[PDB]
């Protein structure tokens, strides 16, 4: 097994450019072909192009000629995608991937980088703990209200509480994104054990923790 | 460009059944030796996962419930037996010709027995009220099928303005759905009313499930 680690989410003004990275561990990037793949929200997959890091050779879908520039750096074992003169249609998740060690399948994929093209500024979320109204199981919540752009990452107790969790996809409301999450535990678990919602929002460089506390 | 047409666009299959998905190419994707067709599974928020390469080879680490077949223009992905973890979108992709292209995907849903939602209501947090806001949240959790109706009543009047409804993707373990309904008011508007009700109407009963609180 190997790992492809992509750079973090980015908010880009229309007309500006951005450069994404894809750092490989466990193998030499010269021994494969790298690909970049675009996925617009709720849409399918679009192959942008590929590079052979052993010699830099590239091949693009003509649709992306001029828009996309793929490079690689063997010194840092990293592949790159530069997107130029961005417009709203460039808002997407971008993936890097490698070919089975260019005509075979893509067997390893990065985690994706969210790129949002917008004139709107970053807005950090307001994170609210949701305790039950003032049985054998109890359901707690976390409301992540009014942020821009996507994504956020939400965990419970820093990820150690993962069973019984429902994290609801973010949606636009009132010009910003709102997301929520519930966790259900046994009534002997809470409030006896502390349960905390942890929310990170890369664009605003914020990281907040909200402990769920019984109402009074 | 090679156009890959997948069928069906969506399907529901029960646990333990076999199913097949079709991928048809606009021109041949073959050499003398291989068909350059690959299949991927994708769940929302995750990258695609390779299942089958070169039409019929099972990717290392993938369960031997996935198999692929076909040549020339007509390709098939088989899942046998289907498990709950298979709820996902499936894509085919060709690499015989540049540009590489993908099909538009097949969304696989798991069919299971109907389940009523577990409903929980949450008044605005004290912190949100300090900020001058007020959202009322209702979770409708672990129900089936996905179709469900949520209504908000404030002091006996139904309200849809300001309601935000978000469904989870189908659960990879129990194949249920969950949904979050948030009624967002201003705080000055919230504390002028006292009765707040989330009502869940689902095919598992003609009478709605009602959760309420008094401010």
Author numbering:
A (entry chain H): 1 to 52, 52A, 53 to 82, 82A, 82B, 82C, 83 to 97, 100C, ...
B (entry chain L): 1 to 27, 27A, 27B, 27C, 27D, 28 to 211
What do the study authors state?
To define the 5C4 epitope on RSV F, the crystal structures of 5C4 alone and in complex with RSV F were determined. Crystals of the 5C4 Fab diffracted X-rays to 1.5 Å resolution.
RSV F is a class I fusion glycoprotein that is synthesized as an inactive precursor (F0) that is processed by furin-like proteases at two sites to generate three polypeptides: the N-terminal fragment (F2), a 27-amino-acid glycopeptide (pep27) and the C-terminal fragment (F1). RSV is sensitive to neutralization by antibodies directed against F. Neutralizing antibodies target six known antigenic sites: two of which (sites Ø and V) are considered pre-F-specific and four of which (sites I, II, III and IV) are available to various extents on both pre-F and post-F14. 5C4 was elicited in mice immunized with DNA and recombinant adenovirus expressing RSV F, and was identified by screening hybridomas for neutralizing activity (positive selection) and binding to recombinant post-F (negative selection), where each of these steps utilized F protein sequences derived exclusively from subtype A virus.
